[PDB]
Ligand SMILES: Cc1cc(CN)nn1C
């Protein structure tokens with residue numbers, strides 16, 4: 576997260592860190608057994624880390640649970656990043672509490688102008704490289720489909736939306752991949768892609784979660 580703020584420990588209780596020896600992606604806890612992330616975060620040997628603030632220090636509220644299976648969306652295209660969504664099942668159910676909590680799926684799509692919260696442990700610099708240990712947060716509005724498409728000619732599908740600031744300065748970045756965009760207590764987005772970070776007229780692009788609620792529910796119901 577570039578140009579954000581320190582969230583505060585366990586203030587984003589649905590935020591998870593995916594770890595394969597190191598943090599490599601974010602994710603969102605959607606029930607006691609399931610995490611939603613980006614398809615471009617797929618790899619083997621995933622441990623889901625819940626209750627994290629400082630990802631380098633065991634602070635006392637963590638739950639570390641290995642993934643038993645991952646399900647990349649059937650229509651994910653890694654070239655275009657269309658359908659950039661994946662489900663991860665935990666080997667054991669997380670113990671839910673005030674600091675480890677699920678986020679609700681949307682019942683309808685969110686509009687341009689809706690204010691959202693984006694979070695993660697990604698790079699905090701737009702030019703150089705610096706990775707925070709503690710969770711960073713950014714309040715950002717959803718941008719219009721027209722402005723999103725104008726920013727990225729030929730690249731925005733019906734399964735994507737832009738959020739952030741056309742002026743630059745505030746954005747998601749490398750390492751925030753797969754993490755949450757939450758608006759009015761609903762998971763509306765997943766950190767998917769962009770062109771650099773916090774650059775003018777290059778806002779973050781996010782997977783449009785409301786398009787996938789049926790797939791998520793049916794997949795969970797049979798797996
Ligand atoms: C994960 C991610 C988000 C963004 C948006 N600036 N770019 N990347 C690489």
Ligand SMILES: [Ca+2]
Nearest residue numbers: 629632633634
């Ligand atoms: Ca920790």
